[PDB]
């Protein structure tokens, strides 16, 4: 048995490498490095923070105050929020408008404050990739990001620019182009409690910036498709996911190194695993992330998977195969064009062309026990991760959001044992990158806010 001989010889090999618990167990170099550890400074940014907010089953779920404030902007795309240590929120749309909200009036719907709308006036007079230093967006703003301190919001989209606006007036303070032709930005994330931005640009590139210095730190390379989502916490690590290469990478940005995590679910072995006694299959494209803590994260796929990954395992720890359902099959009055229902039913091939909803938004509350998933099934899902950190489980649903969920994130309130949050979710009737979405089933372009309690 050749793989048995491989495992056996590898075991003998590791035993021989060990060859080349007592009462005294102290090692001189380890305790010397621990003396240097006692000598050093800056136990602030580099907390390898584990899950210290265990509250998944604690708070209420089923009776949230859900207000779906519809807004008149075609296809809202992103949502950025802010809390100091009054709270503002930000939305941005495919109609080239950024909009500031106040959200701190917690028991009611948010309040519009200020527009900032680019348009055809901001097309540059050059068509030349480094004099892209205009003051507004002329194409398809895809992402906003508020500063952790709140001086600025920074936004960008398919016009390959980063425009950083002031908070108090929504004015463009600085323009930083991405200096090449395909340099469309797709996701932005500040590292927490900082002034450092991580943008993920479709050149298979990740750009980093210091916003209050108007400088770019480091460009870091290495995905294989467009870097569709990004996520960061207080550590200088980052977690990006490229779309169709089906890998999620995490980046030690000062070292400029990474850990890659591929997928790897196969319907052959999965249907055999069920065949030991079923509509589930392989993977299209890993789409969204959120780093839950500094040892784990969660990925949202294109076949409706939500997966939970550790920092110490290439293959994922936990899967959840169907997370928002399978799409309604196309009707017999809109598949075939024959006359009889028998042939128009034969043109469905049974179950072979039922496609699942793909999770287009995922948000893990940082270091907490609970994350929120959203797609165009109409109902957001709330999941909590078990305390042994090897599984998660569906708590409840938030069914007042008709449309695609282009963004989810939460806003905190309450103290250490009694808490209430408003879950913002940007709702559109069209995916945040291309159109591709038919059967617009009662959708509206709005902000689904929910107020969850206890």
């Amino acid at each position: 048995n050749p793989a048995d001989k491989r495992r056996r010889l590898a075991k003998q090999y590791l035993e021989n490498l060990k060859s080349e618990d007592e009462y005294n167990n102290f090692d001189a170099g380890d305790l010397d490095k621990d003396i240097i550890a006692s000598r050093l400074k800056e136990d602030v940014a580099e907390q390898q923070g584990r899950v210290f907010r265990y509250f998944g089953d604690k708070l209420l779920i089923s009776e949230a105050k859900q207000s779906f404030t519809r807004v008149g902007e075609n296809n809202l795309t992103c949502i950025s929020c802010f809390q100091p240590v009054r709270l503002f929120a930000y939305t941005v749309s495919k109609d080239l408008q950024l909009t500031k909200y106040d959200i701190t009036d917690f028991s009611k719907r948010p309040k519009k404050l200020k527009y900032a709308k680019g348009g055809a006036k901001y097309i540059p007079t050059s068509k030349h990739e480094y004099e892209n230093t205009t003051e507004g967006h002329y194409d398809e703003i895809l992402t906003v990001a508020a500063s952790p301190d709140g001086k600025y919001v920074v936004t960008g989209g398919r016009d390959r620019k980063l425009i950083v606006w002031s908070t108090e007036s929504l004015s463009p303070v600085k323009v930083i182009p991405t200096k090449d032709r395909r340099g469309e930005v797709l996701s932005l994330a500040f590292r927490k409690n900082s002034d450092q931005l991580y943008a993920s640009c479709a050149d298979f590139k990740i750009r980093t910036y210091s916003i209050n210095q108007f400088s770019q730190l480091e460009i870091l390379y290495g995905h294989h498709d467009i870097v569709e989502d990004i996520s960061a916490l207080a550590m200088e690590r980052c977690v990006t996911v490229g779309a169709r290469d089906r890998t999620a990478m995490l980046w030690k940005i000062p070292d400029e190194t990474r850990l890659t995590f591929r997928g790897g679910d196969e319907p052959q072995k999965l249907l055999r695993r069920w065949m030991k006694e079923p509509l589930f299959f392989c993977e299209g494209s890993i789409d969204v992330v959120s780093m839950v803590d500094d040892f784990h994260f969660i990925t949202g796929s294109d076949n409706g998977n939500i997966c939970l990954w550790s920092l110490a395992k290439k293959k994922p720890i936990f899967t959840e195969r169907i997370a928002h359902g399978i799409l309604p099959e196309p009707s017999f009055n809109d598949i075939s064009g024959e006359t009889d229902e028998e042939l128009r039913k034969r043109q469905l091939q049974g179950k072979k062309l039922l496609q699942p909803f793909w999770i287009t938004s995922l948000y893990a509350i940082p270091y907490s026990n609970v994350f929120i998933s959203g797609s165009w099934s109409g109902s957001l899902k709330v999941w909590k991760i078990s305390d042994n950190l090897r599984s998660f489980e569906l708590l409840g649903e938030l069914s007042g959001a008709k449309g695609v969920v282009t963004k989810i994130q939460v806003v905190e309130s309450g103290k250490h044992g009694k808490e209430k949050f408003r879950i913002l979710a940007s709702i559109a009737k069209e995916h945040r990158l291309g159109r591709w979405i038919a059967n617009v089933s009662g959708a509206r372009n709005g902000i689904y806010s929910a107020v969850i309690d206890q």
Partner: protein
């Protein structure tokens, strides 16, 4: 007779048996990721050198760790550099093709003699091999 303090027998060797085929199989079946670089950052002289091998980037990581750890630049020490840098780069452009060293496939060194086929757990009894299984 009597004892005599032998650092060569309580010194960490771990290199007589470090074979790259076994280490590659362990990296394959490791189930924890591997700290690879952002892809352009590991080529060396605009491509005039190789990419860099895995042992060379391990050694580079060790040198920069020691470097930052006690605040000292390493030097251009003539005898050691005329040995190691020139012989190392010439066997690098000999055997390292595209970031992968193929020098081992051209080298007689028995795998199972030194690095496999355990010597301490040799199990030279039927009873000892029976107890080692069960």
């Amino acid at each position: 007779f009597e004892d005599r303090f032998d650092a060569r027998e309580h010194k960490d060797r771990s290199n007589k048996s470090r074979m790259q085929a076994m280490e590659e199989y362990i990296r394959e079946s490791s189930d924890q990721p591997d700290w690879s670089a952002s892809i352009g950052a590991d080529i060396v002289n605009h491509g005039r050198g190789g990419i860099k091998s895995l042992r060379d980037t391990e050694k580079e990581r060790r040198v920069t760790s020691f470097e930052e750890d006690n605040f000292t630049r390493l030097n251009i020490t003539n005898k050691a550099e005329k040995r190691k840098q020139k012989q190392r780069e010439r066997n690098a452009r000999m055997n390292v093709i595209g970031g992968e060293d193929f020098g081992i496939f051209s080298s007689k060194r028995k795998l199972e003699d030194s690095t496999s086929r355990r010597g301490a757990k040799k199990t030279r009894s039927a009873w000892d091999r029976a107890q080692r299984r069960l």
